[PDB]
Amino acid sequence: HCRLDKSNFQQPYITNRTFMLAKEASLADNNTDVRLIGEKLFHGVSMSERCYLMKQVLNFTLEEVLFPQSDRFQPYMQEVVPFLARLSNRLSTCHIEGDDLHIQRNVQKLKDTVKKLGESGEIKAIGELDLLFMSLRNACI
Amino acid sequence: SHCRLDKSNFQQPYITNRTFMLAKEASLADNNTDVRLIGEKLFHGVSMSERCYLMKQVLNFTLEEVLFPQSDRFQPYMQEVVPFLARLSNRLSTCHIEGDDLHIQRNVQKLKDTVKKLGESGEIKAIGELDLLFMSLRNACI
Amino acid sequence: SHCRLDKSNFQQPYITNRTFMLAKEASLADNNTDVRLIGEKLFHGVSMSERCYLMKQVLNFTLEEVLFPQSDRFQPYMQEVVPFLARLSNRLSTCHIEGDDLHIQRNVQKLKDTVKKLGESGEIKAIGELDLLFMSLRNACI
Amino acid sequence: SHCRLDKSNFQQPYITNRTFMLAKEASLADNNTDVRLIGEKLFHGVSMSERCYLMKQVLNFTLEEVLFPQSDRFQPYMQEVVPFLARLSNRLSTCHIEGDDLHIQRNVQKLKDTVKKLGESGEIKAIGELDLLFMSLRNACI
Amino acid sequence: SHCRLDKSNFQQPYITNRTFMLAKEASLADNNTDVRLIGEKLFHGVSMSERCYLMKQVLNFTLEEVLFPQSDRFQPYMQEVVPFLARLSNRLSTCHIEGDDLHIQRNVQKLKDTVKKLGESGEIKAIGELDLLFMSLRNACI
Amino acid sequence: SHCRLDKSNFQQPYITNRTFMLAKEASLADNNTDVRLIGEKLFHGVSMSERCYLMKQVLNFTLEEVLFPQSDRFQPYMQEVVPFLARLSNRLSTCHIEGDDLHIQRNVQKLKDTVKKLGESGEIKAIGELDLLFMSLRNACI
């Protein structure tokens, strides 16, 4: 069962940090065509499965994007990662009954895009932490 | 003229805390929560450069159709945050874009509709998200 | 913490092709072929759950003692493959096992010995085996 | 024997992308990602010269027992990659080995067994690894 | 013709034991004693090379008109054996003969008739003979 | 003085598999694929109730003039199947029929003649038909 308490998204300090990190990383992004978290990602996914979908994206973002580039974007990274990780932890006892193929297919497209763009693909992801934060909030509360 | 605000605009004393406290308070009263206003959809088809203009539209709507009309409620928070947002709106009044703003207006339209359809509670939900509107303004315009 | 690499790391055609071509390039220059570095003996006595850790060691050694000292040769493959393998080695830093890693270190040691003893061409053999390293990382860590 | 495909066999326009897409699609459906088919073990006791023959055996099995059957699922990828692999199998007709192929057959046997024992999902896992099979074919036969 | 299943299709003895257990269970309920389905007559006028095709017809009929309606009875055996036989049928969809199949169709007709004429019990007798059908399939198609 | 074999004799997976594999082995060595020892002509004019007795004769002949003399061939199948068939032939030695067995002996004779005339390969053909002998004994005697 996937739900996150809204209180997680209402603290001024950490919210500001997460958004400044997104700004920082985006001021170093060049792709003006591809948006990782957008309409295509949620396409064909019911409201009730969106939090589960976001769980995948968050896991990927911590694992293959944030944990890597830790030596960068200081001192934002140092505060934001623990926070996102706490959230990813809460969502581990969260699953869905049905078929998650269409969902995994959507996430796959995002994972592909990041790996293909390599180094900067990770930069783009971090530049989108503001959309990640908004998506987690809307899908999980 | 241009679409941008000096970072000093978002460093004024305790404006951020107040805005979040206001949002928290109004959130307590938000019955309908299966419906969100600010989020991923709002940005569909909008480039990084256009975001500040998009946020300008949402801020203008929020002030005129939501904040000035509920200015008597959620005190004393309301009184401290509104004037600040009003000045911000004024500072952005010359913010414009060249291309077509059809996508932006269609997105904003969806937000106005949701707020209008929910009546009094639509106004509450809008205030309950001033924190995200504010952080989005900061990111888009500095 | 845990040892895991996302499968997306091993599903990109371009870098996979490069890593395999580099292995082919280096193998077309290996004279010795009477001892396989990555084989049955390396994984013998190692549980499935500890294989990724084991591969962590072998990858560290391959980057450290084999790939950097060689960065010069096998162009332009080496120039693309090394960064890629490095990123993976980086990710596996958080990879730790609780129990005793003596049998594991023993096995890795045997591989390190063989490469050092064959000297110059030992490093060539290792690079010739990147395809097996890539398959081994993929199977052990996803 | 004549185990040598012309390097032109592996440069077809968008064949590589298709094969990887097919493997990605099928991978999504692989529950036993904790069981592996292609990898280090498949090559035990097989010399560089014999690898192309070994891959020939694996390719033949994959086509006859996995692809030619499950041919309806995973469209449109399946229809673009199979015909190509069938021609490759045919092209490997002039490929044989002189010595004893007992080790090679025992290795291939392990692969066939795993695929058969897992029933339908065994077929899925095989397709989920066409990428590694294809890259191993290229390496072994050019 | 494309009838020559890989021997691995019939080498997961778990499946063999299950098929015989299923046959034993259904045999207990076979009141009818005079009539038999599988045996010498079924092969009249069929050459060794044609037997796999003949068995394919019988297997297709047994799956569609027998194992499907009784799928709820004889648990848990039924659930373990059917899927396996279905994959086999599928795997044989790619098997045909050139010459005239009139002798074969006449033989299969005699089997279908016996099964249909006996109604519900004809289905039971058919299941009671899955052991002989299975061993005949193995012999004809590998 | 009854002719009967318990069905349990024909429902054991291990020995059934062996008997059939032995028939496969011996048939892969039969050239004359243009003659059927156990077929329509053998049972022609024989009532259901006398079929077991008829099979008793054929089994005795197959053990005596075909399997015992050929005990060195087709290992290791022969070593397991012959004792099995022998136990069954032993059980049937009391099996008798009251009436006239001229037409029956006439039919068996034709089978004996054919095998002896084809000499060495006639015995091979017989062994290649053990699967039909097994099915015939089962249908006639249970």
Ligand SMILES: *[C@@H]1O[C@H](CO[C@@H]2O[C@@H](C)[C@@H](O)[C@@H](O)[C@@H]2O)[C@@H](O[C@@H]2O[C@H](CO)[C@@H](O[C@@H]3O[C@H](CO[C@H]4O[C@H](CO)[C@@H](O)[C@H](O)[C@@H]4O)[C@@H](O)[C@H](O)[C@@H]3O)[C@H](O)[C@H]2NC(C)=O)[C@H](O)[C@H]1NC(C)=O
């Ligand atoms: C008909 O019977 C055969 C043979 O039966 C087996 O062998 C006899 C002598 C007795 O010991 C019986 O108890 C056995 O059941 C069956 O084929 C054998 O099947 C078994 C298990 O299904 C196979 O063993 C597997 O071997 C795998 C490794 O394969 C390699 O090693 C074997 C061993 O010698 C070798 O023969 C083969 O060529 C490979 O080199 C291993 O991974 C797995 O765990 C298991 O141990 C055995 O290999 C098969 N033998 C052969 C050559 O057929 C049939 O399954 C059975 N048919 C049916 C439909 O029931």
Ligand SMILES: *[C@@H]1O[C@H](CO[C@@H]2O[C@@H](C)[C@@H](O)[C@@H](O)[C@@H]2O)[C@@H](O[C@@H]2O[C@H](CO)[C@@H](O)[C@H](O)[C@H]2NC(C)=O)[C@H](O)[C@H]1NC(C)=O
């Ligand atoms: C978002 O945070 C920035 C920076 O955070 C400040 O420094 C951190 C190390 C930490 O100590 C935080 O508590 C601080 O707020 C804020 O910008 C700073 O604001 C202070 C006072 O307002 C000022 O003295 C600094 O120079 C500013 N540093 C800059 C230019 O980044 C910013 O106000 C916060 N945003 C909002 C709207 O709340």
Ligand SMILES: *[C@@H]1O[C@H](CO)[C@@H](O[C@@H]2O[C@H](CO)[C@@H](O)[C@H](O)[C@H]2NC(C)=O)[C@H](O)[C@H]1NC(C)=O
């Ligand atoms: C192999 O492992 C060693 C540690 O055993 C890694 O060394 C670390 O290197 C970083 C700088 O790159 C230092 O900050 C750490 O302090 C080092 N750790 C130790 C043990 O001191 C090394 O980076 C690894 N090699 C690769 C490239 O994977």
Ligand SMILES: *[C@@H]1O[C@H](CO)[C@@H](O[C@@H]2O[C@H](CO)[C@@H](O)[C@H](O)[C@H]2NC(C)=O)[C@H](O)[C@H]1NC(C)=O
């Ligand atoms: C692996 O990448 C190489 C790139 O080096 C591909 O080979 C080149 O392909 C282009 C376009 O078809 C040809 O014009 C060149 O002749 C090739 N270069 C060389 C020197 O080989 C190759 O196709 C890729 N391999 C696979 C299997 O996709």
Ligand SMILES: *[C@@H]1O[C@H](CO)[C@@H](O[C@@H]2O[C@H](CO)[C@@H](O)[C@H](O)[C@H]2NC(C)=O)[C@H](O)[C@H]1NC(C)=O
């Ligand atoms: C086949 O039939 C013959 C005769 O019908 C059996 O021969 C008998 O064998 C016993 C035991 O050795 C002797 O005491 C009898 O005198 C034999 N009778 C005849 C007519 O010779 C033989 O045992 C049978 N073989 C099998 C295995 O069925």
Ligand SMILES: *[C@@H]1O[C@H](CO)[C@@H](O[C@H]2O[C@H](CO)[C@@H](O)[C@H](O)[C@H]2NC(C)=O)[C@H](O)[C@H]1NC(C)=O
């Ligand atoms: C049994 O045999 C029939 C005919 O050989 C098989 O084919 C029928 O069903 C298929 C389903 O995919 C169709 O694609 C075929 O066109 C259709 N053919 C006819 C003439 O109806 C059927 O799949 C077989 N079933 C089994 C159990 O193998």
Ligand SMILES: *[C@@H]1O[C@H](CO)[C@@H](O)[C@H](O)[C@H]1NC(C)=O
């Ligand atoms: C991410 O997912 C893996 C398994 O897919 C899990 O083991 C790991 O703990 C997760 N990390 C988080 C909470 O992001």
Ligand SMILES: *[C@@H]1O[C@H](CO)[C@@H](O)[C@H](O)[C@H]1NC(C)=O
């Ligand atoms: C909104 O925009 C209108 C002009 O389109 C302007 O007159 C009005 O004052 C604005 N609202 C605020 C408070 O900025």
Ligand SMILES: *[C@@H]1O[C@H](CO)[C@@H](O)[C@H](O)[C@H]1NC(C)=O
């Ligand atoms: C596979 O091998 C068999 C046996 O040699 C051969 O008859 C068949 O044509 C081959 N199939 C493929 C797909 O190459």
